[PDB]
Amino acid sequence: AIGDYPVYYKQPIRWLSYHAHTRPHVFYAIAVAALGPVFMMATPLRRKFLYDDHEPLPANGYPLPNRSRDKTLTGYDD
């Protein structure tokens, strides 16, 4: 097989080489696109080795203290 089109399930390595030579417009668009979801999967690796996720934003309105109203609150009265 000096120039035969490779069969993917028998020659996986040569099958990609055929497409990395004759179809550079397909092979590297797939290669670039897959590098996104691949990087998403390596997010847990970054958490344990680089830095934790930031604290979530306070985007839920005014932070209401979880308690009952103060009863001895005075001052600034009429």
Partner 1 sequence: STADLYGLISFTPKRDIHHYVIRVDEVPGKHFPTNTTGNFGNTVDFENLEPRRKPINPYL
Partner 2 sequence: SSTHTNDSLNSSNYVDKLKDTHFVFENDKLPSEIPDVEEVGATTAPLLSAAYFIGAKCQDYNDDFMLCQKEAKGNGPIDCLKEGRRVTRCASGVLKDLNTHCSDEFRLHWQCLSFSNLEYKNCRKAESLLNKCVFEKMNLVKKIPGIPEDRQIHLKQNPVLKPVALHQDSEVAFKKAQNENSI
Partner 3 sequence: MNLEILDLSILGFYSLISSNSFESIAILVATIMPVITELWYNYSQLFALLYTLIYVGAVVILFVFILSVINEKESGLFILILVLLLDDLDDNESNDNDYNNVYITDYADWFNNYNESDLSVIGNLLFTEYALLLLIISFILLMSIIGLILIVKKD
Ligand X SMILES: CCCCCCCCCCCC(=O)OC[C@H](COP(=O)(O)OCC[N+](C)(C)C)OC(=O)CCCCCCCCCCC
Ligand Y SMILES: CCCCCCCCCCCCCCCCCC(=O)OC[C@H](COP(=O)(O)OCCN)OC(=O)CCCCCCCCCCCCCCCCC
CA dihedral sign, ordered 69, 73, 76, 78: positive
Per CB under 6 A, 33 contacts ligand CDL: yes
Q: Give the number of residues in contact with partner 1, rule: CB under 8 A.
A: 5
Backbone interruptions in the chain following residues (C to N > 2.5 Å): none
Q: 45 is in the binding site of which of ligand CDL, partner 1, partner 3, none (Cβ under 5 to 8 A by kind)? A: none
Residues that bind ligand Y (CB under 6 A): 9, 37, 40-41, 43-44, 47
Q: Which residues bind partner 2 (CB under 8 A)?
A: 55, 58, 62-65, 67-70, 73, 75-78
